[PDB]
Structure 1
């Protein structure tokens, strides 16, 4: 059990928004250095793929050369129903195993996005927390970001999507900003990129929601 191959899904943001190329990464881990003959094969829908980028093997803390194989995949190919399997052939590895991963879930569901203002107990703190509730989406592949005046706010942490009683998923996005910024009247928009939304994008703005 030397080569332990792990296949990871593409980036949930880049798989529907065009800023970076989404990519299935199939990188073996804890691989011995005595067998540098590794063949990487992709057989999505039975068709071999030969334009993938082959990162050179990198030395780790142990005596393992980390060979990295990355495949550039179009957004619309992963968005529809297409199964991606990674086949790795090694001399020490007995028989290559196809790691079947895909986005072919049951049925896409449009998330409902709600921006919640900070509690009045939080207003005494120096930094207030801005909450964006994104609920209702069935595929866990989602991207929730924050922005203010058209520029991103990187001081946010988003919970992983968890499954509720409806069978869909929900998460939360907490944005930490200064109390002066919130009390000055500045607006903040929670940007959500789910494949079931219109144009794969929605945005809800909160600056003062009282009533």
Structure 2
């Protein structure tokens, strides 16, 4: 069995529903106490999804999935750290091409649970690649996210923004913007 934690974005936004995924009769125990608010998705020729509440996962509660094998998962322990967010404009060499890479550097955060997205002019940009966190030399994590855009969109002067969500950020959210010049 593979017990996946919720998605970082779900646990940080109240509107969304964070849920543990007990990928394989199911029985869930929150720090011992049993719960029956779980569900079972159609068997795919199975997955049990346990809806959790935000503050409990973020407060380090432990979630066990016991199917009839016991496996448990919980948020990583340790002093959290606020992510630093930097945006790097395209390099001179890459401007000789039809597409350019916009980079978002996020370093110095703990735990590794984090969400990154891009957007422009109020619309979400979808053509981006985010590497998984890397353990840095000081015990914290860093990552990069790369947004690829047609050079014409960049040279026109449009503003592109890297949005980052982490538990240790004020309002669980911050943003850095980037444009020509």
Greater than 4 Å deviation, 4+ residue runs? none
- Per the alignment, in what secondary structure is the counterpart of residue 99 of structure 1? strand
Post-superposition CA distance 1:75-99 (Å, at most 9, x none): 221111201111111xxxxxxx321
Post-superposition CA distance 1:157-204 (Å, at most 9, x none): 001000010100000000000101111111011000011000100100
Are the counterparts in 2 of residues 80 and 104 from structure 1 also a CA contact under 8 Å?
A: no
Alignment match, 2:6: 10
Are the counterparts in 2 of residues 137 and 170 from structure 1 also a CA contact under 8 Å?
A: yes
CA-based RMSD of the aligned residues comes to 1.7
How many angstroms does 1:47 deviate by? 1.1
Larger Rg: 1 or 2?
1
- Per the alignment, in what secondary structure is the counterpart of residue 55 of structure 2? helix
Distance in 2, matches of 1:84 and 1:107, equals 21
- Correspondence list, 1:81-100, <5 A: 81-89=60-68, 97-100=69-72
* TM-score (structure 1 length as normaliser): 0.81
Q: Which runs of 5+ in 2 are unaligned?
A: none
- Per the alignment, in what secondary structure is the counterpart of residue 43 of structure 2? strand
Distance in 2, matches of 1:147 and 1:69, equals 33
Are the counterparts in 2 of residues 108 and 137 from structure 1 also a CA contact under 8 Å?
A: yes
Are the counterparts in 2 of residues 133 and 172 from structure 1 also a CA contact under 8 Å?
A: yes
- Per the alignment, in what secondary structure is the counterpart of residue 58 of structure 1? coil
How many angstroms does 1:146 deviate by? 0.4
Alignment match, 1:92: none
- Per the alignment, in what secondary structure is the counterpart of residue 153 of structure 2? helix
Alignment match, 2:18: 22
Are the counterparts in 2 of residues 118 and 129 from structure 1 also a CA contact under 8 Å?
A: yes
Distance in 2, matches of 1:104 and 1:123, equals 41
- Per the alignment, in what secondary structure is the counterpart of residue 21 of structure 1? coil
Post-superposition CA distance 1:98-128 (Å, at most 9, x none): 2121004111100000000010111111011
Distance in 2, matches of 1:205 and 1:126, equals 22
* TM-score (structure 2 length as normaliser): 0.94
Aligned residue pairs: how many?
180
How many angstroms does 1:210 deviate by? 8.4
Distance in 1, matches of 2:3 and 2:180, equals 46
Which of the numbers 137, 146, 164 marks the counterpart of 1:192?
Answer: 164
Post-superposition CA distance 1:1-57 (Å, at most 9, x none): xxxx1111111221212453121110xxxxxxxxxxx92111111111111121122
